[PDB]
Amino acid sequence: QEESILQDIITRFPNVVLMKQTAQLRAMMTIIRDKETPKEEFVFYADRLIRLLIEEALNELPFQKKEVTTPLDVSYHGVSFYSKICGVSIVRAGESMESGLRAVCRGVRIGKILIQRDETTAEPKLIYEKLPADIRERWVMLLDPMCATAGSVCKAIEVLLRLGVKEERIIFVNILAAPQGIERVFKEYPKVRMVTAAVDICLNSRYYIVPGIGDFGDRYFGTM
Amino acid sequence: QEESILQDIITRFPNVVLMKQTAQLRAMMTIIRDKETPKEEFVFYADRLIRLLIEEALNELPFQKKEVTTPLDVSYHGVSFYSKICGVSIVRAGESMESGLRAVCRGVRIGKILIQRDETTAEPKLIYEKLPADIRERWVMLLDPMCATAGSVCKAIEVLLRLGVKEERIIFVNILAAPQGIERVFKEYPKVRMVTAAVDICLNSRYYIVPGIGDFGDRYFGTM
Amino acid sequence: QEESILQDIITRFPNVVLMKQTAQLRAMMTIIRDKETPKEEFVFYADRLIRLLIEEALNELPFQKKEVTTPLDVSYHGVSFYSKICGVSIVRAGESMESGLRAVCRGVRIGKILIQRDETTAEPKLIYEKLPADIRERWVMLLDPMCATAGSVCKAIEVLLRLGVKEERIIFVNILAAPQGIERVFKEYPKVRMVTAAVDICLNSRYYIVPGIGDFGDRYFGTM
Amino acid sequence: QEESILQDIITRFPNVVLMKQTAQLRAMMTIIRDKETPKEEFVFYADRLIRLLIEEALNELPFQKKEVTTPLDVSYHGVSFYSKICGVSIVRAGESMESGLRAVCRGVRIGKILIQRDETTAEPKLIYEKLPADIRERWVMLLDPMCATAGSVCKAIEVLLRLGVKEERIIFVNILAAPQGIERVFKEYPKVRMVTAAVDICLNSRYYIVPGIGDFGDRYFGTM
Ligand SMILES: O=c1[nH]cc(F)c(=O)[nH]1
Ligand SMILES: O=c1[nH]cc(F)c(=O)[nH]1
Ligand SMILES: O=c1[nH]cc(F)c(=O)[nH]1
Ligand SMILES: O=c1[nH]cc(F)c(=O)[nH]1
């Protein structure tokens, strides 16, 4: 059923890459998913998993072939990545991915976007934002652990687009998604790329994925 | 070329586990092999590459299965890793990987084995060792980044078998190997697992792998 | 003249703790005060200094004596810390410090506060906040790299106080201050402690500290 | 008692540098000294202390003045550290300190020296060494957590001197020392510098420092 669900997302949206479901990724997901998990532990594995997710997403950047010469003085043919990029996090749950992103891309520029779903309706509203100036010319690693309704990421995307970011240069990095948020995301912005660790089954009346993980941001920041 | 070699090696040696040759992987490999790379950059990228490799490798241990219930108060079918392990680094080069093991496995016990081959005779002698008392009952991640002749890792496997470690409980973690190294290891110890990041074409007259990386230990620690 | 400002500040405000001015500490500040330093470098050293700075601030927590016995089976007279604490960051600049608090306090609870000065006038207004539930009972490490006029940091405290946090349980962690701000902080909230690394002589019309460091937040996040 | 102690040595040996005995340090020492603290923790806290210890030693190096210009387009008179350095670990316990060193000094060259006391004679002898080719041109941070009798470090020093390093250019970085140890190092190489974090009362009948911490290397690497 998971299977059947993984593959359908997969045969269905060529734009998503599903991180390889190794025994290890699964163990990590287990610890994180578990309610019994203390904060010290949760942060540790959450951080552990995030480095892996990023390392994977980084493969969507573009690269050229580069050839070098070894100390043995022979030629090796490889590649290099030349793109200007930056990471944008959606406050606050997205903030927990910055570190991972910064651990591998030393000094990478970081934008932050604050979105709040309206009280009356629940239309999502852009509250605050600080983005690199020339973000129009960069590839963007859009950071957000959970993808329920996709309400927020979609808003985030709306704004990035507004500023001139090309849809095709946006890499949505995520941990846990819902078939439904996946669908809305590609229905509005088919050109984006989305890299995820996991797809769960359904969404709750409170719009929490399930089986899910609970409130990620509170769990990670300890604002339980 | 490389694809063939890769295929055959993969075909005659089923306990080899070559890492996913992603574009990021290659790129790291690219910077690490370059003769011009400054020491600070070499180290930084080695560690990065190293972290991914350890993560690959941990997938070789046995894992339980575990059902957990989430904050959504429903259950999750996870997995848990229940074995007892340790890291054994082959001094000095293998030491470069310890940190990576420790980054992912906090407090993991670490054993060290200094093998050195004799000046005239050229043979590997055991010169220094300091291991965990119960290594007999553990899974060992043997760490040594280069594998050319397999001359020394073979001596390290021998002493571990004399302390009573099970052969099939040894996981040999490596960055770069030569086909000949591979053949040897598996000829003497068919029951080990080996996880590697790259397999080079062959070795030169001086028994250095090529196109290779040079002297890993020397480039990592700064003694050349 | 530095000394002169350092001491006059030091004798007037019993509650401020200045870090010992070491050649290395000054070497870090030199690098980060300089306009020519690259993002990757600025971030490195800012992270470096921050860690020393928290380590310092943490000695303002209360601790009990504890006696243990050494592996030698002789007793040693320790001094355990045991109070509940949490860090609270002032978005955005302050957030650069949480990583340091987390480096040293595994899974420490983190609270975020977003305050924006008011356009027409100039009063700092609470834009958004997310704190631990039981914060009234914790000691708080309030983080904000800079302290010009102190408006923002007098607002964050105001809200803290209203949430019930006891004033003498608040530790203000700061890299750089202007006397002026140091003055408003204590006139308003005499009972709180402030730990800082440097005090600069003056403030400019745009409210920047001089010779100071420029806009900390953007140089660290690279939105400059 | 202890105070009479730090007093005599600080008085008799002008090149010793004890770190500030702050509450946390004590606290830290308290956890690492306890016989019931588990491996994961012992390492976490040892690393934490070691990092402060190294920041401290880094101050022993020569430094230049440097005036920079801040973004406020004004001058700042900093300092800069210009010497060539490298760390040299006394294998195996000294190895635990490399990481600290490498966390603050990226890419520093690291030399290693393994010295053992003969099984019968007790004489300490050089067993293995790999060091930067130009160590004589550098300032040496010598790490060894423990200094009892000082047999080991004295021998270490001796080989660096045979290699040509300047006695005055060696900074001996230590976690715990016994008076006997200090007096010996000084009688023998009065020109070196020693930065330590604590000085214990004495040696057991068996040559262990008390109250001590026991075998560091074993508690650190997990060989206990
Ligand atoms: O933090 C969360 N956001 C959205 C979700 F659907 C969920 O489970 N958790
Ligand atoms: O460090 C190394 N040892 C052996 C080799 F063959 C090689 O290439 N590198
Ligand atoms: O980042 C900064 N903002 C405001 C200041 F006054 C200052 O010195 N730095
Ligand atoms: O590990 C140790 N080495 C040397 C000592 F003197 C001691 O007490 N502990």
Q: Which domains does chain C have, with CATH numbers?
A: 1-224 (3.40.50.2020)
CB of A110 within 8 Å of a chain C CB? The answer is yes
Question: Closest ligand to A223 CA?
Answer: 1
Give contacts of D195 with chain C, Cβ < 8 Å.
Answer: none
Phi-psi region of B14 (alpha: psi -120 to 50; beta: other; left: phi over 0): alpha
Residue D80 contacts C where some CB pair is shorter than 8 Å: yes
d(CA C183, CA C186): 6
From D112, D114, D222, residue closest to B110, measured CB to CB: D222
Question: Pairing mode, if any, of strands C202-203 and C209-210?
Answer: antiparallel
- With an 8 Å Cβ cutoff, is D136 touching chain B? no
Q: Are C169 and C120 in contact (CB under 8 A)?
A: no
DSSP C72-125: TS-EEEE--B---EEEEEEETTTHHHHHHHHHHSTT--EEEEEEE--SSS---E
Give the nearest partner residue to B221 out of D39, D110, D223, using CB atoms: D110
Residue among A212, A171, A211 nearest A195 (CA): A171
Report which residue type is found at C89.
Answer: S
Burial class (CB in 10 A: 0-12, 13-18, 19+), A201: middle
Q: Which ranges constitute the DSSP H helices of chain D? A: 2-12, 23-33, 39-58, 98-104, 151-163, 179-188, 216-221
Q: Which two tokens stand for residue A120?
A: 């009356």
Interatomic CA distance for residues D216 and D200, integer angstroms: 14
Nearest Cα residue in chain B from A57: B24
> Which long-range contacts does B202-206 make (Cβ < 8 Å, 24+ apart)?
B202/B178, B203/B148, B203/B149, B203/B178, B204/A72
Do B96 and B51 touch, CB atoms closer than 8 A? Answer: no
Which tokens belong to A115? 């979105």
The experimental method is X-ray
Torsion of CA B178, B184, B189, B192, to 10 degrees: 10
Atom in ligand 2 nearest the alpha carbon of residue B215 = 1
d(C-alpha D45, C-alpha C192), whole Å: 29
Provide the angle, in degrees to the nearest 10, between the axes of the packed helices B23-33 and B39-58: 140
User: Under an 8 A CB cutoff, do D43 and B128 touch?
Assistant: no
Give this entry's resolution in angstroms: 2.3
Look at strands D109-117 and D124-130 and give their pairing: antiparallel
Q: Going along chain C, which residue ranges are E strands?
A: 16-18, 66-69, 75-78, 85-91, 110-116, 125-130, 139-143, 146-147, 170-177, 193-199, 202-203, 209-210
In angstroms, the CA C81 to CA D23 distance is 9
Nearest to C161 by CA among C190, C196, C183, C184: C190
CA–CA distances in Å: residue D80 to residues B39, D62, D86, D171: 21, 9, 17, 19
Atom of ligand 1 nearest to the CA of A213: 8
Q: Which residue of B has its CA nearest to A27?
A: B79
From the CB of residue B147, how many other CB atoms can be counted at a distance below 10 Å? Answer: 26
Angle B44-B49-B50 (CA atoms, 0-180°, nearest 5)?
95
**What is the CA(C196)–ligand 3 centre distance, in A?**
15
Residue B91 has which token pair? Answer: 């001094």
> What whole-number distance in Å separates Cα of residue A157 and Cα of residue A162?
8
Query: In this complex, which of B114, B127, B131 lies closest to D223 when CB atoms are compared?
Result: B131
Q: Which candidate, B224, B86, B217, places its Cα nearest to that of B142?
A: B86
Cα A74 to ligand 1 centroid, rounded to whole Å = 52
CA–CA separation, C109 and C102 (whole Å):
9
What SS3 state is found at D105?
Answer: coil
β-strands D75-81, D63-69 pairing: antiparallel
C-alpha distances out from residue A1 to A4, A8, A196, A200, B70, Å: 5, 10, 18, 10, 19
| Alpha carbon of residue D114 to chain centroid | 16
What's the gap in Å between the CA of B194 and the closest CA on chain D?
A: 24
Looking at ligand 2, which residue's alpha carbon is closest to its atom 7?
Answer: B208
Q: Which amino acid is at D126?
A: L
- What the block records as the tokens of A146 is 């959970």
Chain D interface disruption, residue of B85, B104, B223, B224, most D CBs within 10 A? B223
Integer-rounded Cα radius of gyration of chain D? 18
Q: Is B202 among the annotated ligand-binding positions?
A: no
Q: Which residues of C touch D22 (CB under 8 A)?
A: 59
- The residue among B70, B146, B200, B207 with the most chain A CBs within 10 A of its CB, best to mutate, is B70
Closest CA to B198 of B50, B61, B86, B12: B50
Q: Do A107 and C223 touch (CB under 8 A)?
A: no
Q: How far apart are the C-alpha atoms of A78 and A98, rounded to whole Å?
A: 28
Residues D118, D121, D206, D223: which is the catalytic one?
A: D121
| Cα of C60 vs its chain's centroid, Å | 12
Q: What number of C-beta contacts closer than 8 Å exist between C and D? A: 133
* Residues of C that are catalytic: 117, 121, 215, 218
- Residue C120's CB is within 10 A of a number of other CB atoms, namely 5
Expressed in angstroms and rounded, the spacing between residue C14 Cα and the centre of ligand 2 is 61
Instruction: Classify C136 as helix, strand or coil.
Output: helix
Report the C-alpha gap between D129 and D137 in whole angstroms: 18
Cα separation, C205 vs C202, in Å, equals 10
Phi-psi region of C40 (alpha: psi -120 to 50; beta: other; left: phi over 0): alpha
Q: Does D128 touch chain B (CB under 8 A)?
A: yes
Nearest to C194 by CA among C15, C12, C9, C5: C15
Q: Which of C203, C213, C219, C221 to mutate to test the pocket of ligand 3 (most atoms within 8 A of CB)?
A: C213
Residue type, D22: T
Residue C14: DSSP 8-state: T
| Cα dist from A160 to A15, B136, D221, whole Å | 19, 57, 49
Element (H, E) at A173: strand A170-177
Sort out which chain C residues have CB atoms less than 8 A from A105's CB and list them: none
Where do the DSSP E strands lie in B24-169? 66-69, 75-78, 85-91, 110-117, 124-130, 139-143, 146-147
- Binding site members of A for uracil: 209, 214-216
Nearest-5° angle of CA B128, CA D219, CA B193? 55
Say which ligand is closest to the CA of C206: 3
- SS3 state of residue A224: coil
